[PDB]
Scaffold this active site. Sequence first.
Site, PDB file in Angstrom:
ATOM      1  N   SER A  35      22.987 -12.252  58.370  1.00  0.00           N
ATOM      2  CA  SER A  35      23.606 -12.927  57.224  1.00  0.00           C
ATOM      3  C   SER A  35      22.503 -13.764  56.583  1.00  0.00           C
ATOM      4  CB  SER A  35      24.773 -13.767  57.687  1.00  0.00           C
ATOM      5  OG  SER A  35      25.478 -14.314  56.565  1.00  0.00           O
ATOM      6  N   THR A  60      24.190 -10.095  52.109  1.00  0.00           N
ATOM      7  CA  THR A  60      23.837 -11.039  51.060  1.00  0.00           C
ATOM      8  C   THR A  60      25.024 -11.829  50.519  1.00  0.00           C
ATOM      9  OG1 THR A  60      24.118  -9.325  49.385  1.00  0.00           O
ATOM     10  CG2 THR A  60      21.944  -9.573  50.278  1.00  0.00           C
ATOM     11  N   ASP A  90      28.474  -9.683  50.544  1.00  0.00           N
ATOM     12  CA  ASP A  90      29.623 -10.337  51.171  1.00  0.00           C
ATOM     13  C   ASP A  90      30.484 -11.076  50.137  1.00  0.00           C
ATOM     14  OD1 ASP A  90      31.049 -10.977  53.581  1.00  0.00           O
ATOM     15  OD2 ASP A  90      29.912 -12.865  53.791  1.00  0.00           O
ATOM     16  N   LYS A  92      33.676 -10.701  49.203  1.00  0.00           N
ATOM     17  CA  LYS A  92      35.037 -11.110  49.570  1.00  0.00           C
ATOM     18  C   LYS A  92      35.924 -11.126  48.312  1.00  0.00           C
ATOM     19  CE  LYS A  92      33.345 -13.218  53.788  1.00  0.00           C
ATOM     20  NZ  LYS A  92      32.827 -14.378  54.581  1.00  0.00           N
ATOM     21  N   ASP A  95      40.967 -10.556  43.861  1.00  0.00           N
ATOM     22  CA  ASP A  95      41.606 -10.664  42.554  1.00  0.00           C
ATOM     23  C   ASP A  95      42.344  -9.350  42.340  1.00  0.00           C
ATOM     24  OD1 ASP A  95      42.126 -11.262  39.701  1.00  0.00           O
ATOM     25  OD2 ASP A  95      40.358 -12.633  39.817  1.00  0.00           O
ATOM     26  N   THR A  99      40.458  -6.672  37.495  1.00  0.00           N
ATOM     27  CA  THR A  99      39.370  -7.624  37.452  1.00  0.00           C
ATOM     28  C   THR A  99      38.282  -7.310  38.471  1.00  0.00           C
ATOM     29  OG1 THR A  99      40.658  -9.411  36.479  1.00  0.00           O
ATOM     30  CG2 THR A  99      38.807 -10.066  37.844  1.00  0.00           C
ATOM     31  N   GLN A 208      33.938 -23.594  60.398  1.00  0.00           N
ATOM     32  CA  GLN A 208      33.421 -22.377  61.032  1.00  0.00           C
ATOM     33  C   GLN A 208      33.589 -22.546  62.536  1.00  0.00           C
ATOM     34  OE1 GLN A 208      33.130 -19.422  60.955  1.00  0.00           O
ATOM     35  NE2 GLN A 208      31.034 -18.713  60.437  1.00  0.00           N
ATOM     36  N   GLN A 209      33.951 -21.451  63.193  1.00  0.00           N
ATOM     37  CA  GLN A 209      34.057 -21.404  64.652  1.00  0.00           C
ATOM     38  C   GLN A 209      33.177 -20.269  65.151  1.00  0.00           C
ATOM     39  OE1 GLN A 209      38.453 -20.775  64.305  1.00  0.00           O
ATOM     40  NE2 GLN A 209      38.568 -22.487  65.761  1.00  0.00           N
TER      41      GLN A 209
HETATM   42  C1  LIG Z   1      44.430 -13.917  39.359  1.00  0.00           C
HETATM   43  C2  LIG Z   1      45.482 -14.185  40.230  1.00  0.00           C
HETATM   44  F1  LIG Z   1      45.239 -14.887  41.354  1.00  0.00           F
HETATM   45  C3  LIG Z   1      46.757 -13.623  40.061  1.00  0.00           C
HETATM   46  O1  LIG Z   1      47.725 -13.844  40.829  1.00  0.00           O
HETATM   47  N1  LIG Z   1      46.945 -12.804  38.982  1.00  0.00           N
HETATM   48  C4  LIG Z   1      45.978 -12.571  38.073  1.00  0.00           C
HETATM   49  O2  LIG Z   1      46.176 -11.775  37.122  1.00  0.00           O
HETATM   50  N2  LIG Z   1      44.673 -13.071  38.231  1.00  0.00           N
HETATM   51  C5  LIG Z   1      43.832 -13.196  37.018  1.00  0.00           C
HETATM   52  O3  LIG Z   1      44.637 -13.579  35.874  1.00  0.00           O
HETATM   53  C6  LIG Z   1      44.312 -12.792  34.726  1.00  0.00           C
HETATM   54  C7  LIG Z   1      45.480 -11.892  34.278  1.00  0.00           C
HETATM   55  O4  LIG Z   1      45.064 -11.323  33.040  1.00  0.00           O
HETATM   56  P1  LIG Z   1      46.037 -10.255  32.282  1.00  0.00           P
HETATM   57  O5  LIG Z   1      46.735  -9.388  33.298  1.00  0.00           O
HETATM   58  O6  LIG Z   1      47.036 -11.098  31.504  1.00  0.00           O
HETATM   59  O7  LIG Z   1      45.066  -9.558  31.382  1.00  0.00           O
HETATM   60  C8  LIG Z   1      43.092 -11.956  35.091  1.00  0.00           C
HETATM   61  O8  LIG Z   1      41.897 -12.638  34.686  1.00  0.00           O
HETATM   62  C9  LIG Z   1      43.208 -11.868  36.606  1.00  0.00           C
HETATM   63  O9  LIG Z   1      41.902 -11.734  37.188  1.00  0.00           O
HETATM   64  C1  LIG Z   2      33.047 -14.586  55.835  1.00  0.00           C
HETATM   65  C2  LIG Z   2      34.230 -14.302  56.510  1.00  0.00           C
HETATM   66  F1  LIG Z   2      35.189 -13.594  55.880  1.00  0.00           F
HETATM   67  C3  LIG Z   2      34.528 -14.852  57.766  1.00  0.00           C
HETATM   68  O1  LIG Z   2      35.587 -14.615  58.398  1.00  0.00           O
HETATM   69  N1  LIG Z   2      33.594 -15.676  58.329  1.00  0.00           N
HETATM   70  C4  LIG Z   2      32.404 -15.925  57.748  1.00  0.00           C
HETATM   71  O2  LIG Z   2      31.593 -16.726  58.275  1.00  0.00           O
HETATM   72  N2  LIG Z   2      32.086 -15.437  56.468  1.00  0.00           N
HETATM   73  C5  LIG Z   2      30.653 -15.330  56.108  1.00  0.00           C
HETATM   74  O3  LIG Z   2      29.863 -14.947  57.262  1.00  0.00           O
HETATM   75  C6  LIG Z   2      28.683 -15.746  57.370  1.00  0.00           C
HETATM   76  C7  LIG Z   2      28.685 -16.637  58.627  1.00  0.00           C
HETATM   77  O4  LIG Z   2      27.386 -17.219  58.680  1.00  0.00           O
HETATM   78  P1  LIG Z   2      27.032 -18.282  59.865  1.00  0.00           P
HETATM   79  O5  LIG Z   2      28.237 -19.135  60.166  1.00  0.00           O
HETATM   80  O6  LIG Z   2      26.648 -17.434  61.069  1.00  0.00           O
HETATM   81  O7  LIG Z   2      25.854 -18.995  59.280  1.00  0.00           O
HETATM   82  C8  LIG Z   2      28.602 -16.591  56.106  1.00  0.00           C
HETATM   83  O8  LIG Z   2      27.793 -15.925  55.126  1.00  0.00           O
HETATM   84  C9  LIG Z   2      30.060 -16.667  55.679  1.00  0.00           C
HETATM   85  O9  LIG Z   2      30.145 -16.811  54.254  1.00  0.00           O
END
Ligand SMILES: *c1c(F)c(=O)[nH]c(=O)n1[C@@H]1O[C@H](COP(=O)(O)O)[C@@H](O)[C@H]1O
Ligand SMILES: *c1c(F)c(=O)[nH]c(=O)n1[C@@H]1O[C@H](COP(=O)(O)O)[C@@H](O)[C@H]1O
Lengths: 257, 257
Positions: A35, A60, A90, A92, A95, A99, A208-209
């Site tokens: 990481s 990354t 990474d 994650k 949305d 999007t 963090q754990q």
């Molecule tokens: C994020 C979110 F956490 C939701 O529950 N729903 C959701 O649509 N998003 C963001 O809101 C906008 C919706 O745009 P539309 O569908 O009206 O064009 C987006 O930017 C979406 O990422």
């Molecule tokens: C992301 C994730 F979804 C987890 O469940 N846990 C987690 O820590 N992350 C990412 O992993 C790396 C951990 O790094 P460290 O604690 O060993 O320095 C981080 O990049 C974190 O964003």
Amino acid sequence: KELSFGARAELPRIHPVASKLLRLMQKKETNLCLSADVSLARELLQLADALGPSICMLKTHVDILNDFTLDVMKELITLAKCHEFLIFEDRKFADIGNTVKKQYEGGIFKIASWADLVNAHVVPGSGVVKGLQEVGLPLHRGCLLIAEMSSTGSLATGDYTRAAVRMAEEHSEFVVGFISGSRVSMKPEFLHLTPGVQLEAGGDNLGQQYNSPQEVIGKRGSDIIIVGRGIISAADRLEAAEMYRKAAWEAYLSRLG
Amino acid sequence: KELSFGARAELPRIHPVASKLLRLMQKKETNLCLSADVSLARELLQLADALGPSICMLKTHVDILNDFTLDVMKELITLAKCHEFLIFEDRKFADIGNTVKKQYEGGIFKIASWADLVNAHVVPGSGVVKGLQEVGLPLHRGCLLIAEMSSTGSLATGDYTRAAVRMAEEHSEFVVGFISGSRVSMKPEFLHLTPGVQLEAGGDNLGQQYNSPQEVIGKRGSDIIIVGRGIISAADRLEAAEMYRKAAWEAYLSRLG
Ligand SMILES: *c1c(F)c(=O)[nH]c(=O)n1[C@@H]1O[C@H](COP(=O)(O)O)[C@@H](O)[C@H]1O
Ligand SMILES: *c1c(F)c(=O)[nH]c(=O)n1[C@@H]1O[C@H](COP(=O)(O)O)[C@@H](O)[C@H]1O
């Protein structure tokens, strides 16, 4: 009965990205993902070069790089090819499909243009996977689903974890595995990658754990350890990576029998 | 009994960012947040200028801007100040505290330097809020927690939603409200912002579901509608925004009595 990484690389339902990874894990005797949590491109690239032979994957967060450019990523790909490791952004994603499709292909980062793997949270429902796969499938990429998190108070437990597994199974053309703390799927085609790993007991001050490689790979049945600060904060990052590689690899062998 | 936006702006436990928002909603008779989902800076800025008088907030995804620079954000802030709206970066943070702290302050985007509001998923546990607040509190920013999502198969339901509410309550110095489909907290200090809004029934092909402003504000008790494509894909985006503003505002008045 448990199959080696090399045999898993050949499974009928294996995804090509998974099979490439599994083969190089076998070849190099590494199930360590670095990481690379640094803010400078130079340090990222110096770590990728020196530690490349010890790792199966370099993870990354490009949104933390202060001096990101696409040419930095080009130079990372050169190192990945030289040393044989995958690049995992990474990000994650978490949305709606419409999007994430955009965040994966576009913007400044153009993640899909250089990342072999990305990951996604399952909270939005399966549209998050559909949106990513629109971009990822044509580019021959793979995705991991976040079935469990390492942090205190994680809500990715119980039925949420089961939902991630079902979502993966149902999108196996693109989803190659999980971010999880333990084996969550019975199906050997799926990879399990586990963050929250250090040799010593502990955590950080922001939830963090940590668990050890022997616990995560040996007792909990995961495939790959993801290690950030345990390596990055060490004085000698090469010897730290080797420590982690030997730990995870021997845990794997001893689980295999 | 329900308090107006202007009275809520004065509540003892109101956060300063919430109070600024509530005051300008009252002043301008708008509870519409524009989801400025475009890939070009010029179009973002032209929309922010023309629609600024109609909106209480402009929501960004800067990671989709093809030509992001910090100078674009400077020009957005000028428009926000001229027209009186908040800037909300819809980053939906969803990582451990230590990492989100970095993604919020740093990297290319320096989100905390220009965004009045950001939002976070609760899946990682409360460390996600602690990490963000390390950066956000000194900069006088606020955060929304994603208690529900609009997309099909959303896992943000039941105990997960209740966990988001508890997490908000417990971090009220930084958390000013929710992304949700309906009122989820009884406490009037908290804002409820709802994406997934269009005048007509429907959805998209990647899991988005729509409900009308009258349903969301009037029947479900939310405060602000977030509208992207319903406005952005229209020929006349100014008249579309006015349509949405009048809808959400009248729903609010009719709920107030
Ligand atoms: C994020 C979110 F956490 C939701 O529950 N729903 C959701 O649509 N998003 C963001 O809101 C906008 C919706 O745009 P539309 O569908 O009206 O064009 C987006 O930017 C979406 O990422
Ligand atoms: C992301 C994730 F979804 C987890 O469940 N846990 C987690 O820590 N992350 C990412 O992993 C790396 C951990 O790094 P460290 O604690 O060993 O320095 C981080 O990049 C974190 O964003």
